[PDB]
Amino acid sequence: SMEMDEKDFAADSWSLAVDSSFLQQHKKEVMKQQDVIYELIQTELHHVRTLKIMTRLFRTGMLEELHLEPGVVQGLFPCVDELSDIHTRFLSQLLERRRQALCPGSTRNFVIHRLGDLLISQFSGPSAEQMCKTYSEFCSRHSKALKLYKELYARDKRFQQFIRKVTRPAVLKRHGVQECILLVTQRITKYPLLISRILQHSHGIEEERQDLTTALGLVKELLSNVDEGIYQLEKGARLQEIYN
Amino acid sequence: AIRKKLVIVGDGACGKTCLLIVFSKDQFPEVYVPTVFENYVADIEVDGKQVELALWDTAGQEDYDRLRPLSYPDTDVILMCFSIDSPDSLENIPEKWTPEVKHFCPNVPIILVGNKKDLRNDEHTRRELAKMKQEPVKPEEGRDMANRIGAFGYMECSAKTKDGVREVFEMATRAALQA
Ligand SMILES: *CC(=O)NCc1ccccc1C
Residues 6+ apart with CB under 8 A from B79: B6, B7, B8, B9, B16, B19, B110, B111, B113, B168, B172
Residues B3-177, CATH architecture: 3-Layer(aba) Sandwich (3.40)
Spans of all domains in chain B: 3-177
SS in 3 state form for A109-143?
CECCCCCHHHHHHHCCHHHHHHHHHHHHHHHHCHH
Q: Contact, A80 vs A56, CB < 8 A?
A: no
Total structural domains within chain A: 1
d(Cα A238, Cα A139) in Å, to the nearest integer? 20
* DSSP codes, B91-116: HHIIIIIHHHHHHHSTT--EEEEEE-
Helix (H, G, I), strand (E, B) or coil at B41: strand
Residues of chain B contacting residue A188, judged by C-beta atoms under 8 Å apart: 67
d(Cα A141, Cα B171) in Å, to the nearest integer? 34
Nearest chain B Cα distance for residue A213, angstroms: 17
**Looking at the partner chain, which of A146, A182, A193 has a beta carbon nearest the beta carbon of B56?**
A182
Nearest to B118 by CA among B131, B140, B104, B137: B137
Does the beta carbon of B12 lie under 8 angstroms from any beta carbon of chain A?
no
Helix, strand, coil fractions of chain A, as percent rounded to 5 = 75, 0, 25
Helix (H, G, I), strand (E, B) or coil at A38: helix
Dihedral sign computed on CA atoms, order B124, B129, B135, B136: negative
In angstroms, what CA-CA distances link B110 with A180, B13, B44? 25, 19, 19
Radius of gyration of chain B (CA): 16
Instruction: Report CA dihedral (B23, B28, B34, B36) to the nearest 10 degrees.
Output: 0
**Resolution attained, angstroms:** 2.2
d(Cα B85, Cα B137) in Å, to the nearest integer? 7
Pairing of strands B40-46, B49-57: antiparallel
d(Cα A73, Cα A57) in Å, to the nearest integer? 12
Radius of gyration of chain A (CA): 20
Nearest to B110 by CA among B159, B178, B49: B178
Residues 6+ apart with CB under 8 A from A46: A1, B38
Half-sphere CA count of A158, side-chain side, radius 13 A = 8
Q: Contact, A191 vs A219, CB < 8 A?
A: yes
d(Cα A140, Cα A181) in Å, to the nearest integer? 12
d(Cα A141, Cα A218) in Å, to the nearest integer? 24
Nearest to B178 by CA among B48, B103, B76, B53: B76
d(Cα A160, Cα A105) in Å, to the nearest integer? 50
d(Cα B101, Cα B74) in Å, to the nearest integer? 12
- The arrangement of strands across the sheet holding B2-9 comes to B40-46, B49-57, B2-9, B77-83, B110-115, B153-156
Residues of chain A contacting residue B36, judged by C-beta atoms under 8 Å apart: 39, 43, 190, 193-194
Residues 6+ apart with CB under 8 A from B30: none
Amino acid code (one letter) for B80 = M
Site from A46, A48, A182, A199 to mutate, B interface, most B CB atoms within 10 angstroms:
A182
**Which residue pairs, CB below 8 angstroms and at least 24 apart, start in B138-146?**
B139/B114, B141/B87, B141/B90, B142/B82, B142/B84, B142/B90, B142/B112, B142/B114, B145/B82, B145/B90, B145/B93, B145/B94, B145/B112, B146/B112
Return the ligand 1 atom nearest residue B116 CA.
Answer: 3
Q: Do A16 and B74 make contact, defined as CB atoms within 8 angstroms?
A: no
d(Cα B89, Cα A154) in Å, to the nearest integer? 41
Residues 6+ apart with CB under 8 A from B43: B1, B50, B52, B53
d(Cα A130, Cα A170) in Å, to the nearest integer? 35
Q: Contact, A116 vs A212, CB < 8 A?
A: yes
d(Cα B12, Cα B10) in Å, to the nearest integer? 7
Largest Cα–Cα distance of chain B, in whole Å? Answer: 50
d(Cα B105, Cα B175) in Å, to the nearest integer? 14
Half-sphere CA count of B172, side-chain side, radius 13 A = 32
In angstroms, what CA-CA distances link A119 with A100, A128, A211, A213, B57? 17, 10, 8, 10, 24
Asked whether B13 lines ligand 1 (CB < 6 A), one says: no
d(Cα B25, Cα B40) in Å, to the nearest integer? 9
Nearest to B38 by CA among A45, A109, A77: A45
Nearest to A151 by CA among A39, A234, A27: A234
Domain region containing A97: 1-244
Taking each helix axis as running N to C, give the angle between helix A191-199 and helix A206-229, from 0 to 180 degrees, rounded to the nearest 10: 160
H-helix or E-strand spanning residue B54? strand B49-57
Helix, strand, coil fractions of chain B, as percent rounded to 5 = 40, 25, 40
d(Cα A138, Cα A141) in Å, to the nearest integer? 5
Return the ligand 1 atom nearest residue B28 CA.
Answer: 10
Q: Contact, A193 vs B60, CB < 8 A?
A: yes
d(Cα B97, Cα B104) in Å, to the nearest integer? 11
**Looking at the partner chain, which of B36, B40, B66 has a beta carbon nearest the beta carbon of A43?**
B36
Counting Cβ atoms within 10 Å, is residue B127 exposed (0-12), middle (13-18) or buried (19+)?
exposed
Q: Contact, A40 vs A194, CB < 8 A?
A: yes
Q: How far does the centroid of ligand 1 lie from the alpha carbon of residue A241, in Å?
A: 47
d(Cα B97, Cα B100) in Å, to the nearest integer? 5
d(Cα A143, Cα B161) in Å, to the nearest integer? 38
Amino acid code (one letter) for A112 = I
d(Cα A138, Cα A184) in Å, to the nearest integer? 9
Q: How many Cβ atoms sit within 10 Å of the Cβ of residue A208?
A: 19
Q: Contact, A65 vs A162, CB < 8 A?
A: yes
d(Cα A108, Cα A16) in Å, to the nearest integer? 10
